[PDB]
Design a protein around this nucleic acid. Structure first.
Ligand code: K
Ligand code: K
Ligand code: K
Ligand code: K
Ligand code: K
Ligand code: K
Ligand code: K
Ligand code: K
Ligand code: K
Ligand code: K
Ligand code: K
Ligand code: K
Ligand code: K
Ligand code: K
Ligand code: K
Ligand code: K
Ligand code: K
Ligand code: K
Ligand code: K
Ligand code: K
Ligand code: K
Ligand code: K
Ligand code: K
Ligand code: K
Ligand code: K
Ligand code: K
Ligand code: K
Ligand code: K
Ligand code: K
Ligand code: K
Ligand code: MG
Ligand code: MG
Ligand code: MG
Ligand code: MG
Ligand code: MG
Ligand code: MG
Ligand code: MG
Ligand code: MG
Ligand code: MG
Ligand code: MG
Ligand code: MG
Ligand code: MG
Ligand code: MG
Ligand code: MG
Ligand code: MG
Ligand code: MG
Ligand code: MG
Ligand code: MG
Ligand code: MG
Ligand code: MG
Ligand code: MG
Ligand code: MG
Ligand code: MG
Ligand code: MG
Ligand code: MG
Ligand code: MG
Ligand code: MG
Ligand code: MG
Ligand code: MG
Ligand code: MG
Ligand code: MG
Ligand code: MG
Ligand code: MG
Ligand code: MG
Ligand code: MG
Ligand code: MG
Ligand code: MG
Ligand code: MG
Ligand code: MG
Ligand code: MG
Ligand code: MG
Ligand code: ZN
Lengths: 122, 125, 206, 53, 114
RNA sequence: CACCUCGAUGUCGGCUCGUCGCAUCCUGGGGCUGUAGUCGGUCCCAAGGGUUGGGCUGUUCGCCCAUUAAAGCGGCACGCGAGCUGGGUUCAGAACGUCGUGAGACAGUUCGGUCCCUAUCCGUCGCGGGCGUUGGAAAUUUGAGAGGAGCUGUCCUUAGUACGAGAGGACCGGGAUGGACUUACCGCUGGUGUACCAGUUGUUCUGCCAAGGGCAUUGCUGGGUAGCUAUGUAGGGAAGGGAUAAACGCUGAAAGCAUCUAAGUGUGAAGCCCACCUCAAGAUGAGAUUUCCCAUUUCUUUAAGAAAGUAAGACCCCUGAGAGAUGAUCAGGUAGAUAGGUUGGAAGUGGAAGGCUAGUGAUAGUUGGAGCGGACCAAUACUAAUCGGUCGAGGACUUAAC
RNA sequence: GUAGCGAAAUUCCUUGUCGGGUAAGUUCCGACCCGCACGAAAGGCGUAACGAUUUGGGCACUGUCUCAACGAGAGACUCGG
RNA sequence: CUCGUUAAGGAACUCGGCAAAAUGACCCCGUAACUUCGGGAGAAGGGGUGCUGACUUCGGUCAGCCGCAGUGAAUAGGCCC
RNA sequence: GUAUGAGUAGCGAAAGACAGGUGAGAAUCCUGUCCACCGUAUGACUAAGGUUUCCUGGGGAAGGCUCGUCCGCCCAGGGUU
RNA sequence: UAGUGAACCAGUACCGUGAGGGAAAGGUGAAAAGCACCCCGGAAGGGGAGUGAAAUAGAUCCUGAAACCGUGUGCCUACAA
């Protein structure tokens, strides 16, 4: 459950470290975003040499959340942090590497490139 | 569920221990309807512990029964004092060994003058 | 098709492919057709159905006479089912859960649990007022209306008794039917407290 | 808020229509024959259910 | 309740090993990436067990790639091919929620060898 | 303008709650186009529903950021202060600029500054009692009427087809899956869970040890049952009829032609009536069906008379919860599992006490998944629902048919 | 009308213009100076320390809020006075 | 009304972080600009705290034990630009 | 003087339980037991102020926000060396 | 409710630090002959029995209005604005 003003870590080397949520795309009144959803975010803390830099308005996809997801089989997955990956319009990650585990929900959302780069998909 | 009896949790617990011990001592007391309908379960559970009779049940009861003098006699030219807990395990337990629950009964009586509070007599069978 | 039963409770079932779905267990001891209503006698077509045999001391001479036609014990619940083929039902006939098959789509009718006197916030899901910043308006039902009418318009929703309403949930799925135990497992959750009456009918939308 | 108009005798009496006492549950006591409240001990003879208590 | 238990007794599984919170277990969880199906091993410590009968579930926690992950499984789910008890841990409570805050060495659990 | 209000009609903005108009912001239908297609422009019908989250400012407004199908315009005392706020504007303090010889003042700013009222009536939301409904009862019902609901994106296919030189790129039609909203429910994820379990500090009490109680926000801390719950789960706005709006007709004269119209006949919208959900015979127009009771007794009077026992039945009273402010509702009252207890479980907690073993000791192992266990489940009349009482029909007349 | 300061507790026009900070800043800070209408003891400018002073930003923190849920107690509700 | 808890988020509330939350004791390490040289300063930011043995120069240290947590409750600064 | 509001608001910070006694009558008075509260005080002394409220025996009209067999109340005696 | 504020233990009670302000309150019967005795009740208070011409003249005592409150019932009233 990610909403406006919610902050997330960045799970890639795109240059940004911590981002802040601006919008939860996908609906007029939509309030909250969960894994696999895309958000509009701002970079609040960036690596000094990175490509993405502080204060830039970017799009990102949530790849893991404290309130995780429910699988059709009745199982659940929950993570210890909220992390997102900065992506281009075509879902291609801006960075070259993904850090930390990623939720399997991304596959059906068709973030195939991120899934491949992920060190582990759960 | 259980009735609140218009007391905080600790106050309700303290009052229930008092009334249950008073019933253990006297074997018949007059209270209000609500107090009686709660004291029945508490006192009957205490009697269950007494029936069990082992040390574990003894200590469990001691947590609840008040430390009061159930009775006093003079035996062998010496005064013998029996506490509420001792009376439970020595008298009330053996007495009800045969009954399967329902050790107490409640008889409705007239309302109290000061408040019109419905009054009952609760007593061992 | 329709039947009357009791909301036993809720559990979950693993379907084929291992998907886990919540189900409501509704027991329906074979209902009995107590009376058949027709255009000629009553002006409309329906079958009266009785359920949950009742102890005799709890019944009345008029009620016993009413069920005598069907030659069964007194029934605790009686309800009329419409939109059925009268030719297929006759007084004394039994209706069992097997009338439905797994995967049937049904409408389930119940009486929602009662909540008693409830405020507007819970009863109508209205917004609270601010809880600080000097607010003295927390759980109140809002303005009653404009000045001009010199009155309050009807349907200005306020606090009152909540629940106890007849609610129908549509397009539920009959997950399983156990004839031996007179049980129907319906995907989802249905209105009403446990042991309350439940009416299953073939979904009208279908 | 205060009463805009005084309440008339008739309206006052109408409201008090339901402000009445009632006495229920009286029936003869088996032991002594006096009237008693059902399910209560008879205050006269102190018997309930045919036994002294 | 007895009626519900009778209905769900059929789907109750039988090969479940006797484990409690604090034990390390390996879960052979079936996964599907399309037509093909696969077994993905999720190994970690049992943090929580709750529920009764068919509704019973258990949670397993592992730190993968520096991030804590918890997976909750129905105890009797058929999608878990096998549950394997790797180790028995010594814990003093049913729910190990405190482990979430701890990292690395602080999260270690003494084995008992039941 | 000065007609109500100066023996008081509270003023901006915000919040809560909406409701209405249509000069329609989106969605629906349609005509014209300087409409190839995708987009549009303009106009016509259309008010069913929907029509945002922030930065700045007391703000309305406005600008900006980011979204959306859309971010409509207005009225309702610029709706709504006996419903809330009080940041702004009008009190007393103080200061700046400015005016004044001055006290002071604004042709201006700035910091600070008391928002009272127990609801009588109508109105609104719920819930009872009375009587009626023409013999008295127990159920099941029809639906006059009324309320609710009414939104919509994106993707796939049709099809890279129609159109286009290309770029680009469909109508219609068929599928999938969302947003917001909403009706239920706690099996799952969680929340709570003050008579559940455990750990623990201080002090005090049970004579002491051991084991416990009191108080310290439930002392604190970690969990947690039932119940209540959303952020959790399930479902809903699906299809389809009838009459229409704008618009398009067919046939057809008046008016040899022409013409949607006059007669005649049809298509046509998220709109209207149905369809779906709920309430509903106090619908005094009081409806209908099934079942039950039976024509009693006494006195007055031809009385639709009066009163008194009753029947079928209902209630008082009592045990309760799936119900509940109280009434009410529903489950029961020994023709008994209604509650309490008891017995056995379950959740829940996490290994009781008393012992034994090891250790100098703190403590660990073991006896033993133990002990404890509110509300949950199943049995069991052990306790209490005893004994009783009250109310409750005998059915008017006229005229058709039989 | 000097030094100093200047859209200020003073700047109406005004949310002046530029820069910083924010995704976005009529407030805030830095600078500029056409000072409507600063200015030297009704002191000018600056100033460590101090302030239940006014103002803006950040970390932490949270039911302030998204958006409300549960529990305890007092009143409210029923009964007697 | 008074109080306790609250998933995910964490000021998006609001005129304004109003209220609440958070910090809070002692010991140790460590501590900036600026300054009137006194301060700033408890800046900040960190670490330790229970019980049992052994040895202590008596303040410690070494070893071991337990818990989610040791100023285990109560009473004690939020901080910075 | 008496209504209406209305048998309504309120009955003024907090723990009492039961047994026995008294008595026409007891949640409220007495006795006993347990429980609970204050304890740099809610304890013990004093100054001012009050001015008999002190003690003993009676009473239950009124006062006591209920009740009252009881009282700092009423009645009768007495008490300050 | 006039007449002095004061027909009555009034410049009192009461109010105020003080100056000062400042009330309310008349009527049994000719005569107390002021209800012995009995009954319900703890009393209060009643019902008898008595006194009296009269007790619905019983000490709240001459007369005893109205508001206000209640009991009884001849007529009317639960489809009405
Ligand atoms: K005026
Ligand atoms: K058009
Ligand atoms: K509309
Ligand atoms: K704002
Ligand atoms: K603002
Ligand atoms: K409007
Ligand atoms: K106000
Ligand atoms: K008003
Ligand atoms: K009125
Ligand atoms: K202790
Ligand atoms: K104590
Ligand atoms: K909990
Ligand atoms: K009727
Ligand atoms: K043990
Ligand atoms: K157990
Ligand atoms: K300037
Ligand atoms: K100036
Ligand atoms: K800027
Ligand atoms: K300052
Ligand atoms: K200050
Ligand atoms: K809170
Ligand atoms: K918010
Ligand atoms: K500082
Ligand atoms: K530690
Ligand atoms: K401090
Ligand atoms: K009055
Ligand atoms: K009154
Ligand atoms: K006395
Ligand atoms: K007279
Ligand atoms: K009258
Ligand atoms: Mg306590
Ligand atoms: Mg006692
Ligand atoms: Mg809101
Ligand atoms: Mg009007
Ligand atoms: Mg378990
Ligand atoms: Mg004029
Ligand atoms: Mg006036
Ligand atoms: Mg129009
Ligand atoms: Mg901000
Ligand atoms: Mg207005
Ligand atoms: Mg108003
Ligand atoms: Mg001058
Ligand atoms: Mg002016
Ligand atoms: Mg101030
Ligand atoms: Mg749940
Ligand atoms: Mg459950
Ligand atoms: Mg000890
Ligand atoms: Mg049962
Ligand atoms: Mg500026
Ligand atoms: Mg700028
Ligand atoms: Mg000057
Ligand atoms: Mg000068
Ligand atoms: Mg100066
Ligand atoms: Mg009362
Ligand atoms: Mg929270
Ligand atoms: Mg949390
Ligand atoms: Mg804001
Ligand atoms: Mg806002
Ligand atoms: Mg504050
Ligand atoms: Mg502490
Ligand atoms: Mg009132
Ligand atoms: Mg008091
Ligand atoms: Mg102190
Ligand atoms: Mg005295
Ligand atoms: Mg005395
Ligand atoms: Mg009194
Ligand atoms: Mg005078
Ligand atoms: Mg007379
Ligand atoms: Mg007189
Ligand atoms: Mg009518
Ligand atoms: Mg009438
Ligand atoms: Zn008797």
């Amino acid at each position: 459950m990610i909403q406006q003003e919610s902050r997330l870590r960045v799970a890639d080397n795109s240059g940004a470290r911590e981002i802040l949520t601006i919008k939860v795309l996908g609906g007029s009144g939509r309030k909250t975003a969960n894994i696999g959803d895309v958000i509009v975010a701002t970079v609040k803390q960036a690596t000094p040499g990175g490509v993405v830099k502080k204060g830039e308005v970017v799009k990102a996809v949530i790849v893991r959340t404290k309130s995780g997801a429910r699988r059709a089989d009745g199982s659940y997955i929950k993570f210890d942090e909220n992390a997102a990956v900065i992506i281009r319009d075509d879902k291609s990650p801006r960075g070259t590497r993904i850090f930390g585990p990623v939720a399997r929900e991304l596959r059906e959302n068709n973030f195939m490139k991120i899934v491949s780069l992920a060190p582990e998909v759960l | 569920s259980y009735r609140k009896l218009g007391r905080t949790s600790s106050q309700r617990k303290a009052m229930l221990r008092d009334i249950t011990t008073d019933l253990i001592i006297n074997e018949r007391i007059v209270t209000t309807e609500a107090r009686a309908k709660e004291v029945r379960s508490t006192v009957e559970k205490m009697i269950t512990l007494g029936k069990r009779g082992d040390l574990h049940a003894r200590r469990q009861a001691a947590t609840f029964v008040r430390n009061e003098v159930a009775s006093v006699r003079e035996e062998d030219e010496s005064i013998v004092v029996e506490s509420a807990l001792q009376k439970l395990f020595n008298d009330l337990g053996p007495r009800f060994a045969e009954r399967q629950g329902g050790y107490t009964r409640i008889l409705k009586t007239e309302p109290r003058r000061g408040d019109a509070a419905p009054m009952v007599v609760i007593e061992f069978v | 098709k329709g039947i009357l039963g009791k909301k036993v409770g809720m559990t979950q079932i693993f379907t084929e492919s291992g998907e886990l779905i919540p189900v409501t267990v509704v027991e329906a001891t074979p209902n009995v057709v107590l009376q058949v209503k027709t255009v000629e006698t009553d002006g409309y077509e329906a079958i009266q159905v009785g359920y949950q045999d009742k102890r005799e001391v709890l019944s009345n001479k008029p009620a016993k006479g009413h069920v005598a036609k069907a030659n069964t014990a007194p029934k605790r619940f009686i309800k009329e089912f419409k939109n059925v083929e009268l030719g297929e039902y006759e007084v004394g006939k039994e209706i069992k859960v097997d009338v439905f098959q797994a995967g049937d789509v049904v409408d389930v009718t119940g009486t929602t649990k009662g909540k008693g006197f409830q405020g507007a916030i819970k009863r109508h899901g209205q917004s609270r007022g601010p809880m600080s910043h000097g607010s003295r308006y927390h759980r109140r039902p809002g303005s009653m209306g404009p000045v001009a009418p010199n009155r309050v318009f009807k349907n200005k929703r306020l606090a009152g008794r909540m629940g106890g309403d007849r609610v129908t949930i549509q397009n539920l799925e009959v997950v399983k039917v156990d004839v031996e135990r007179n049980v129907i497992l319906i995907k989802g959750n249905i209105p009403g407290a446990k042991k309350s009456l439940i009416t299953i009918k073939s979904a009208v939308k279908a | 808020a205060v009463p805009a108009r005084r309440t008339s005798k008739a309206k006052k009496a109408k409201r008090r229509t339901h402000y009445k006492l009632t006495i229920k549950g009286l029936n003869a006591c088996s032991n002594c024959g006096e009237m008693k409240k059902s399910h209560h001990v008879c205050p006269a003879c102190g018997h309930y259910d045919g036994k002294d208590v | 309740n007895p009626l519900i238990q009778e209905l769900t007794q059929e789907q109750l599984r039988t090969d479940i090993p006797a484990f409690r919170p604090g034990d390390t277990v390996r879960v052979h969880a079936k996964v599907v990436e399309g037509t093909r199906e696969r077994i993905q091993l999720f190994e970690g410590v049992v943090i929580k067990r709750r529920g009764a009968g068919i509704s019973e579930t258990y949670t397993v926690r592992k730190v993968s790639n520096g991030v804590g992950v918890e997976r909750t499984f129905p105890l009797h789910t058929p999608r878990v091919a096998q549950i394997e008890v790797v180790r028995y841990g010594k814990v003093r409570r049913a729910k190990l929620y405190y482990l979430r805050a701890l990292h690395g060495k602080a999260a270690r659990i003494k084995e008992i060898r039941r």
